[PDB]
Homo-oligomer: A and B are copies of this chain.
Amino acid sequence: FKFEFKFE
């Protein structure tokens, strides 16, 4: 259950 969070 991965979760990616990019901000740029």
Question: Which residues of A are at the interface with B, using a C-beta cutoff of 8 A?
Answer: 1-8
Contact = CB atoms under 8 A, between A and B. Distances in A.
A5 to B, nearest CB: 3
9 contacts: A1-B6, A1-B7, A1-B8, A2-B8, A3-B6, A3-B7, A4-B7, A5-B6, A7-B7
Contacts of A7: 1-8
A2 to B, nearest CB: 5
Given A1-B6, A4-B6, 7 more contacts: A1-B2, A1-B7, A2-B4, A4-B7, A5-B5, A6-B8, A8-B8
Nearest to A8: B1
